[PDB]
Amino acid sequence: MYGLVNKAIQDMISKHHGEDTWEAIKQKAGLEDIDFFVGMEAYSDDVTYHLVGAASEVLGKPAEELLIAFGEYWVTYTSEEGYGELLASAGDSLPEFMENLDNLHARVGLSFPQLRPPAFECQHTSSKSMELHYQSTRCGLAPMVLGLLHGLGKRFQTKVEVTQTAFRETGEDHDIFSIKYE
Numbered sequence: 186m187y188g189l190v191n192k193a194i195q196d197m198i199s200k201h202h203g204e205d206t207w208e209a210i211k212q213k214a215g216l217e218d219i220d221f222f223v224g225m226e227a228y229s230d231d232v233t234y235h236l237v238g239a240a241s242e243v244l245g246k247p248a249e250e251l252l253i254a255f256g257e258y259w260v261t262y263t264s265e266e267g268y269g270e271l272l273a274s275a276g277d278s279l280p281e282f283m284e285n286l287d288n289l290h291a292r293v294g295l296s297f298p299q300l301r302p303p304a305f306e307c308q309h310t311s312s313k314s315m316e317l318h319y320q321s322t323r324c325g326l327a328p329m330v331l332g333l334l335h336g337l338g339k340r341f342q343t344k345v346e347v348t349q350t351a352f353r354e355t356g357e358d359h360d361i362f363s364i365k366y367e
């Protein structure tokens with residue numbers, strides 16, 4: 186993924202657990218060679234996976250737990266590192282934000298040609314609920330989506346419940362979430 190993702194992981198871990206832990210996690214992933222991540226440079230996804238994998242081992246938490254937390258961090262981090270207005274441009278509510286997400290990524294992609302954005306499809310079951318279909322070129326990031334959604338709830342001062350109803354790992358086509366929200 187683009188380096189901003191890896192920069193955000195670094196930032197999250199460094200801030201919550203200190204530099205020495207991050208330096209240890211960086212070493213285990215086998216990325217001691219990389220002196221800093223370049224935010225607008227495309228990396229192999231394995232770099233992200235290896236950082237999550239190594240942080241799971243070093244912190245003694247599951248990777249998925251870390252994905253949830255990172256998903257929550259991402260929404261705040263990007264608002265502060267040059268993406269606040271773009272985020273604002275996608276709306277003042279969770280359902281609106283999700284409807285706008287495919288277009289928000291179209292904007293990013295002009296800038297960044299190797300972007301592999303996920304596809305989202307909303308189906309509004311009420312004015313307080315929706316089912317969300319999540320489709321991706323990447324495997325195992327559903328837990329991050331769960332965090333992202335909870336990041337958005339926090340951003341819009343909204344109570345959000347998210348449950349995954351279908352997983353790519355029970356054989357299903359794509360991930361599907363059920364969402365209820367204030």
Ligand SMILES: O=C(O)CCCCN(CCc1ccccc1OCc1ccc(CCc2ccccc2)cc1)Cc1ccc(C(=O)O)cc1
Pocket residue numbers: 186187188189190224225260263268286289293297299300301302303320321322323326329333334337
């Ligand atoms: O892949 C999967 O399954 C999904 C993994 C989730 C990754 N994630 C989900 C976005 C998202 C989802 C839900 C809610 C809020 C969200 O945040 C909105 C938002 C804000 C800011 C930016 C700046 C991007 C940028 C990238 C590079 C340079 C500058 C700017 C992007 C998006 C974004 C992402 C997608 C593809 C790539 C890539 O392909 O690398 C890298 C990152």
